[PDB]
């Protein structure tokens, strides 16, 4: 028989998901060119 | 608080351990000897100046 008959039985068909970007956008550090960095554990 | 441990550089854990040991020895002396001092001694065990 045709494929159209078996379409509704979704459990038979293998599951694949459209690999779309999701979640909020990645955030970058913009301050670093302005700022001069000093790092010390004992400040 | 962790702020106390991190900012206050003079502070550490070693001071607490030292104080614990000091109070610990003081307590040993107290529990062992305070029965002697604090007892309401009777006239049998009191000796005057003489």
Number of strands of chain A: 0
Radius of gyration of chain A: 26 Å
> What is the quaternary state of this protein?
part of a larger assembly
Instruction: Give a short account of the largest sheet of chain A.
Output: none
In terms of DSSP E residues, the strand content of chain A is: under 5%
**Helix share bin of chain A:** under 10%
How would you classify the helix and strand content of chain A by structural class? little secondary structure
Taking the alpha carbons of the first and last residues of chain A, their distance comes to: 76 Å
Shape of chain A: rod-shaped
Annotation field: number of helices of chain A: 0
Account of the protein in words:
- This is part of a larger assembly, with two copies of chain A.
- Chain A has 43 residues and is low in regular secondary structure.
- Chain A is rod-shaped, with a radius of gyration of 26 Å.
- The termini of chain A are far apart.
- The chains hardly touch.
